[PDB]
Symmetry: D2
Subunit: 429 residues, 4 copies
């Protein structure tokens, strides 16, 4: 027989959950059984292995219940949840050389251990933290590395931000570029039209070493379900929301050194936005954003730790003008796809910065409003959105929802990932 | 039920054997079943797990069939032989920062994966390449680190050699010294009288933190069995030895910048001995040793790669006056022990430099001849041995052997480690 | 021709000045000409080199006009100020492996280049980030290294802190310990009794290798002048002090994961101390303390960026009951010294935590109050100050100012460093 | 005023001379004054600063006198020869990560301290050991970094050779590619048409980021002269050359992992091609090459530290019918340039492999023969050289001489780079 294993090496997703990488792992586990079936159809009996850095129960986003949840879920299926030694306190999911080198080593170890017992292995690594893994496996693992195919994904150091990546990130992502060009067993999995281009043109990665791992949402997941107006108003009851004004909603991880989500840009623009109350739902409490909203005399509603139930209500409420997405250069952000789909019938429309994957998601103006990353441009964009006729708005809202169907459907795209990996397994050997 | 695991982390011993670390592993496996028994009596159901850096089939000392034999030994006994990722080509078993950090991460990964399925673990770390394993486990293992006891052995960087150790070596041993002092779950396991005192005052390791892992041999193993006169000459025959002349023998690994066996000392000293032929059997052919043999034009037999069949025959021939161990800072050499035991009845007696553990092996003169590490004192020693009468020689031969029996037996010394280990498992929860 | 250089490798002091290390450099420069004359009496002409990492202008404590004042000061005595490349972005004066390694390389470069132009060097190195410097000069600097004497000072990795020191800090401080025992040209510079003893016993460092660099304050500086009661009040008037209440004062750098100043302990004790007003002049503003004070409902006053003229005023007021010093493990804090000296006439008495150099500073209870590091012990400590008779208070006050004169005069103490260095330089050829 | 500085960071060239890098530094300092005068005519007083690792006096290639000559040469001219801290003992001029990071850090420091006292600096970085100088200066230097143009040359890790480079090499050559794409103050100095092409299709480096540093030989140096056939056999004398009648010379270095020189194909096709008489060489005696020699049946001379005076003559005698250079992919080999120039009246005709910069040297067949790597191809090429036509090999011998004159003049090419660099110092403020 042939027994197949996906090794998912992810910096978050079981113990800790804050962003898209954790959400990718969550989407992964829900689609698992179906993918297993699909692959069985293609001759492979497939097991799932998950590797995530060991975390201190004190880390932002820790949740032991989730951990057990994921561990039990993979175990019943025949897979493992494994916590990998990084060489850190466990109190963060990122670092510099010593954190990357350790986590890569144990990541590569888990890939080879799994390959001893399997017939083939597809090792999906993500983030600069795991980027040295294909080079570590292909350089040293002999007969067992001939069983492994690498797909590396979620971020390569680029020149598309003002903040220059750390030497540690520059080095690890250059390592994986080298190995993608050097080993036919090592591919990049691009997540977006923007990174397939950028990684080809910054790192000289040939077309045959680029596999599709395109960002997507599982549209029919319950958390995206459409809501009646009674439940919408019930759900935002205790959000502290004003009774007057329309909303521009934003949410995500707090911008911190290194990644500039664009929240301050909405706050700057609310100064010249007379009917507009920004609602910024950040993951952790953000004392800094509050300091701005007061320095600008802007009456912002600042939330933290919101469930998606409340965020889904806000986006669906007829009081909500737009959801803004203002990141400096998102490689493959999925929050807009959720907005476009949760607001199928009612609520927000998307305002999307003109950088990273955002223009692709809003179809360059067709399914949403694109804006330059200046306060005046964001203020302009909101006015633009307000000036839309209800005939205009209803076909922009439809066009957005149609796109999430066509391009951003998680089961379609993870099948696109699985299918390419499996097909490539039958040509490298 | 409380399942115990010994995790053995060793730089060689399955894929590759050249020195005493690999002899440790070989002795360990051959003794495993009798340790199951002792530990069974103390209520522990013990299991052996072995971790060795991944090696390229092209490396010095590789052997695919030893590796398959060790792998099966452990697997039949419910344990595991695990090849470990380092950040290397796998062609050598040592390195700089990069090799030490990857191996210590993956060794720590293997300790933690093993605590996941066992009730306690004693992790025996060996050499600077695994010196960081205690802190990697004791900083991030959380509750899994709470069921692990660390014994780090086979070297701490010292100032007893000419070669100043690598900045990587100083870091790794400096790290494990720190953790030995900081955590009641991390101990240095000393391998000799000399090492136990030296590390104690070099690193301020408190006596409670020192554990016995004293070097020793399995005296009643076949390879040390005694030989008929007839059989001795059959083996001596094919090595090309001079028809006349007394023999002084040395064997071990080729000298290299980190380790100075005294091979050069014998050749320099050789001219001052009239009718002595030096026989020097190093692991791999030594072109450099030939050159002082031609400089002093001393008559010498330079063998490479001998089986212990032929080595034993040499150490037992009446044509052999002494075996020489002239290492500069041997921490815990077992070759003298092998010599004092392979020759309880006939043949060589041992010449030991007065540095490292050798004075302890010879009982400071009472079981051998101690010499300074100069070309002159070595000859003085050869001479002294010459002038021993059968009253003094037979007496010196017995003392040495009794000494092995009482201080350097493996079964007793590995149970001292095992007993010390288990005792320390209690007293820490 | 005997030209002598002191090379000062300090993590702050010229571009950036937040804490005691920067206090050191300032004291060094002011004492320079007085010191130069002392060394002129003893046969050397002296020159000062200062080596400080490169710093981005948007950084905590970055004063462009101080860098210029330091640069001109040194160059006018034929000296130099040099900024050193670390492999960092210049925003903070700290890091991990990458930071310590680059800074020590470029620091070791600055010593050797100086040793090319001078006949003798004393190279006084700063924190963990400069600890690799001795082994870097002495392993590779040949004849130039033979002209250098190293004094390493300001804190090693210890087990006196709940925060387990960073692998970078363990590895680096292990390294200089090795080199202290390896070369008579490498010495450790102790700054307190605590430091000395601790090093000797934890790091196994011989008494021959300990050189005095005991922390101290230049008590004739005008910034320690006794303030006249009209002048305290006018200075105090801006701070927002309540009209009632008696003050317990504190000031220093904001606490951070590396280092624990007890600011949150004083707020905790005030929960049991009605009428006591904590006055915590922190370096940057501390939102965390304000949230704490709000939660505990204690009437603390939280200042930031306070000048020492204003701090001196609080310390001298009759309204101020004590100054508190509550650091987890202060190696050689001069801040207690600053209090005991400024309040020689009138004002606070010192409450000192029983760890680090603090008990020695208050002479084990004969010069201030010594307390454990708990909320309740600290609240207890305040009372014992309050119940001291005005009689006993005058006795304490005079003793503390006596002790600064005897034990913590800066000028006497650097002389003691200089003489120890010159002596050691003579001794080793 | 405006003083310009060329800081040359080279792994060898003054203290140690073993390879083409040392040759580049040798030719450089000879043309210093011929560039000092040129650069004045563009308005710059230029100073030359040379940086090199601290070497141990016992290292291969060490010469205390060469280092004293270079130091004084530069000092005479207002420059410096600076020895650079690396994190090794200095016995090798290479390493993995300690070495590259420390060497690049002190290199960047050297550039920056030169940038401080100059108005503009052209920092020419050497191989992977200095690849990180460009980015350590452009991230932390700040103001002084805006006065520096970085030209990194002599090798980027690529995929042409069978050899996979070290992770340390990949990381540093990844780092410099990143800064080269990112900063207009960072350029790669290309040494061949082949290297310029390769760096763009492997590192996505645009030609706009290149500057010429094209590999060249100093034609007018006395060693390159033609001389008498009397001198031919006087310089043949003192060398044990069997006189079969003719030769196919292939001098070079070891054919080992990383640097295959292709001697094997020759040996093979030759011993097979009727009546051809191969000869070879080395730089230090190659015993495995001696092995290959004893292995087949054709003459081979083990040339050991043979001066340039001897080796030129070997190529020029009418016995030599051909010289072959069959490297793996030599990025910018200068020896075929040495062959074509030396045998311009009397000597050999150059045979080149079709890999690396070699087809550029021999003008794609007009000025030499170009042959695929395989030994049946090597036979076919040496077939068209023992067969030599008057209107053919007089016309190609003169093509080869004209090629070195047109493309590979060292005086021409360092001028090209200096002008290119000064030009690009404009266009960046
Ligand atoms: C399915 C999609 O949701 C998925 N492709 C997403 O992956 C992430 S990858 C990432 N996560 C953390 C980091 C480290 C990084 C950071 O925190 O930003 N920093 C620690 C270095 C700053 N990089 C993307 O951020 C996101 O846009 C999106 O592409
Ligand atoms: C059972 C006994 O035989 C056992 N205790 C033995 O352990 C070894 S420990 C060691 N092995 C390799 C190194 C590194 C070292 C090397 O390879 O030599 N170098 C890589 C730095 C050069 N250190 C001792 O050498 C030996 O004496 C003896 O104590
Ligand atoms: C003249 C005297 O003031 C002098 N002896 C003082 O030196 C300093 S040394 C130091 N400063 C910063 C660090 C790094 C450390 C930290 O910030 O705390 N962390 C970055 C690792 C956390 N170490 C002492 O702090 C102080 O007590 C006192 O000894
Ligand atoms: C003037 C010309 O001669 C000049 N451009 C030459 O520069 C050298 S650069 C180089 N030399 C040694 C190494 C490292 C290498 C080694 O030592 O072999 N290894 C340590 C990585 C193995 N890289 C080229 O080799 C050569 O072709 C030629 O371009
Ligand atoms: N409920 C909730 N979900 C969040 C919050 N912040 C982020 N998420 C989820 O995390 C995912 C992050 O998507 P993405 O745009 O890729 O974020 P990024 O990875 O940080 O760039 C989204 O699908 C969100 O649903 C939050 O505050 N509350
Ligand atoms: N058969 C054989 N065994 C060897 C040879 N060289 C070393 N050994 C074995 O390797 C072991 C090394 O023991 P030890 O004295 O500690 O050497 P060390 O570990 O290198 O310091 C000994 O038990 C020897 O039996 C050899 O050439 N032949
Ligand atoms: N003016 C002023 N000086 C400060 C402040 N915080 C710290 N300092 C100075 O920084 C120095 C720190 O001394 P020390 O006790 O060694 O602090 P430490 O290094 O953090 O342990 C003291 O001399 C203070 O004068 C502040 O908020 N204002
Ligand atoms: N005198 C002498 N010079 C040599 C010898 N081998 C190489 N060289 C010099 O070293 C340079 C090597 O050039 P190159 O082809 O680039 O060598 P590479 O850098 O190792 O590829 C040549 O210009 C020679 O002048 C030798 O055996 N003797």
């Amino acid at each position: 027989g042939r027994a197949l294993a996906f090794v998912w090496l992810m910096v978050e997703g079981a113990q800790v959950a804050a962003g898209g990488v954790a959400g990718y792992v969550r989407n992964l586990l829900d689609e698992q059984d179906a993918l297993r079936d699909h692959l069985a159809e293609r001759g492979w009996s497939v097991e799932f292995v998950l590797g995530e850095p060991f975390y201190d129960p004190g880390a932002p986003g820790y949740d032991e219940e989730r951990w057990r949840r994921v561990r039990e879920h993979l175990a019943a299926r025949g897979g493992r949840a494994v916590r990998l030694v990084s060489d850190s306190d466990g109190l963060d999911g990122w670092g510099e050389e010593r954190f990357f080198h350790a986590l890569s080593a144990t990541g590569a170890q888990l890939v080879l251990d799994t390959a001893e017992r399997c017939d083939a292995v597809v090792a999906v690594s993500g983030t600069s933290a795991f980027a040295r893994v294909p080079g570590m496996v292909q350089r040293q693992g002999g007969e067992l590395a001939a069983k492994v195919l690498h797909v590396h994904t979620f971020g390569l150091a680029t020149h598309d931000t003002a903040h220059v990546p750390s030497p540690a990130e520059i080095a690890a992502d250059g390592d994986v570029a080298f190995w993608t060009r050097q080993s036919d067993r090592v591919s990049v999995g691009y997540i977006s039209r923007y990174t397939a281009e950028l990684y080809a043109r910054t790192y000289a990665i040939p077309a045959a070493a680029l596999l599709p791992n395109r960002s997507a949402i599982p549209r029919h997941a319950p958390r995206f379900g459409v809501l009646t107006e009674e439940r919408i108003n019930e759900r935002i009851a205790g959000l502290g929301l004003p009774a007057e004004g329309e909303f521009v909603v934003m949410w995500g991880r707090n911008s911190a050194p290194g990644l500039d989500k664009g929240y301050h840009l909405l706050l700057e623009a609310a100064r010249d936005l007379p009917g507009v109350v920004p609602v910024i739902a950040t993951r952790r409490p953000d004392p800094g954003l509050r300091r701005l909203a007061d320095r600008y005399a802007v009456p912002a509603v600042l939330l933290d730790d919101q469930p998606f139930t409340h965020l889904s209500a806000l986006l669906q409420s007829p009081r909500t003008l737009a959801a803004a997405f203002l990141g400096e250069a998102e490689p493959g952000a999925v929050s807009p796809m959720e907005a476009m789909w949760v607001a199928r019938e009612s609520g927000a429309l998307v305002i999307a910065a003109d950088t990273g994957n955002l223009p692709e998601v809003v179809d360059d103006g067709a399914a949403g409003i694109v804006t330059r990353r200046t306060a005046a441009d964001v203020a302009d964009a909101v006015r633009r959105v307000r000036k839309l006729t209800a005939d205009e708005r209803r076909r922009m809202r439809a066009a957005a929802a149609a796109r999430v169907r066509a391009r951003f459907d998680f089961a379609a795209n993870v099948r696109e990932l699985a299918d390419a990996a499996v097909d490539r397994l039958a040509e490298v050997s």
